[PDB]
């Protein structure tokens with residue numbers, strides 16, 4: 001027997017000894033070793049209600065990544081309003097690793113094994129576990145990177161699809177590779193390569209699905225309508241450098257004669273609007289050599305235009321900024337219960 005409850009979680013990872021990569025270093029002192037023998041217990045004929053938009057695990061993971069980034073990605077200058085601090089900012093080794101979130105004695109994690117689970121409402125195939133799976137804490141905007149994939153169809157996730165102020169998480173069932181490079185020897189100019197055939201096939205399927213939720217209306221994609229570079233661009237961190245990539249070529253409804261390699265223009269930025277809290281961090285110029293990251297696009301962050309009930313269209317724009325939706329997109333099938 002159990003009841004919905006919150007408690008302090010603990011983390012587990014496969015961190016290595018002597019490795020200087022910051023995620024490894026942080027997991028070495030902040031987490032325990034991964035469960036050598038994990039085994040979930042199935043709860044026969046048990047239906048449970050989940051709410052990925054109201055999940056204290058998300059808040060706790062957010063706390064951890066903030067602590068991780070604050071211990072590892074030390075900006076040269078942090079203009080956090082008023083006075084400014086110019087601490088140490090050596091170049092570091094940055095590559096996220098999987099982190100497990102685990103419950104203490106007296107608690108368990110309920111796991112939604114419904115393959116069409118959209119993140120809210122009842123779950124028919126419930127299992128109990130001691131730790132979540134390994135979740136990579138990938139910080140990004142617009143595109144969710146290096147995550148898990150929907151096991152069946154593309155899933156639409158939203159706290160309330162009818163309210164246009166609620167972010168939509170698109171969970172893909174097929175990943176799309178995005179290959180980003182800053183060639184060696186403008187040191188800040190880069191480019192991301194995406195296969196256009198693939199991207200346009202998935203993007204078409206996303207419109208088909210969104211049609212299902214918006215009574216077969218005309219689905220239109222448009223670039224963000226204003227804001228800072230972090231959300232009008234696809235932002236992410238590659239080898240400790242902050243990439244800002246123009247996704248206009250991705251969120252055009254054009255696709256013809258357009259089906260080759262899509263080349264997104266990118267910049268490595270030194271001055272960043274932080275995602276942890278309102279403030280500005282400045283880092284040193286980028287490192288030498290070929291900077292390259294090959295990542296899987298496993299989801300999209302979408303915001304729907306308002307003032308369209310009286311039209312025949314629904315316009316969708318890439319979103320982002322609140323990193324909790326990134327953790328949400330992986331924590332959606334977990335919930336913490338107390339053993340009564």
Ligand SMILES: N=C(N)NCCN1CCN(C(=O)N2C[C@H](CO)C[C@H](C(=O)Nc3ccc(Cl)c(F)c3)C2)CC1
Pocket residue numbers: 139140141228229230231235236237242243272273274275276277278279320321322324
């Ligand atoms: N948890 C709650 N409830 N609020 C937190 C909000 N608090 C306050 C201030 N916050 C902003 O103001 N933000 C707006 C800002 C643009 O002005 C950009 C920020 C960004 O996402 N930065 C970013 C940097 C690097 C990478 Cl790689 C990346 F993927 C993203 C988001 C966030 C946290």
Ligand SMILES: *[C@@H]1O[C@H](CO)[C@@H](O)[C@H](O)[C@H]1NC(C)=O
Pocket residue numbers: 040042113114115125127
């Ligand atoms: C229910 O979940 C279990 C894992 O706990 C899985 O093996 C099984 O295929 C699931 N059943 C359905 C119908 O999805």
Ligand SMILES: *[C@@H]1O[C@H](CO)[C@@H](O)[C@H](O)[C@H]1NC(C)=O
Pocket residue numbers: 118119120121122156157158159160161
């Ligand atoms: C998710 O599924 C539940 C089923 O109970 C439904 O009530 C809810 O509207 C769905 N949400 C979305 C965004 O499809």
Ligand SMILES: *[C@@H]1O[C@H](CO)[C@@H](O)[C@H](O)[C@H]1NC(C)=O
Pocket residue numbers: 146147174175296
């Ligand atoms: C990228 O996707 C492929 C297939 O979708 C998968 O096998 C691979 O593990 C993924 N890579 C990462 C780093 O998640």
Ligand SMILES: *[C@@H]1O[C@H](CO)[C@@H](O)[C@H](O)[C@H]1NC(C)=O
Pocket residue numbers: 151152153154155173174205209
């Ligand atoms: C992904 O989901 C779409 C529907 O959203 C479906 O048409 C397609 O066949 C699915 N792909 C795979 C590989 O399951």
Ligand SMILES: *[C@@H]1O[C@H](CO)[C@@H](O)[C@H](O)[C@H]1NC(C)=O
Pocket residue numbers: 160162163164
């Ligand atoms: C969803 O948002 C719409 C639009 O504001 C609102 O009218 C409706 O009450 C919301 N639904 C719920 C269940 O809160």
Ligand SMILES: *[C@@H]1O[C@H](CO)[C@@H](O)[C@H](O)[C@H]1NC(C)=O
Pocket residue numbers: 179180181193294
């Ligand atoms: C990524 O792009 C670079 C430059 O275009 C290329 O040299 C490299 O082979 C690519 N790698 C993959 C896995 O696509």
Ligand SMILES: *[C@@H]1O[C@H](CO)[C@@H](O)[C@H](O)[C@H]1NC(C)=O
Pocket residue numbers: 195196197198
């Ligand atoms: C792009 O994707 C399509 C379909 O997924 C594939 O057939 C094609 O070979 C890819 N293009 C390149 C240059 O790899």
Ligand SMILES: *[C@@H]1O[C@H](CO)[C@@H](O)[C@H](O)[C@H]1NC(C)=O
Pocket residue numbers: 232233246247248
């Ligand atoms: C992205 O590129 C398009 C076309 O070159 C341009 O109109 C747009 O201003 C760019 N995005 C930003 C945020 O500057």
Ligand SMILES: *[C@@H]1O[C@H](CO)[C@@H](O)[C@H](O)[C@H]1NC(C)=O
Pocket residue numbers: 095096138145146236237238239293294295296
């Ligand atoms: C995604 O995973 C690949 C393989 O592990 C890695 O090379 C890449 O840097 C990751 N991307 C991000 C944005 O962390």
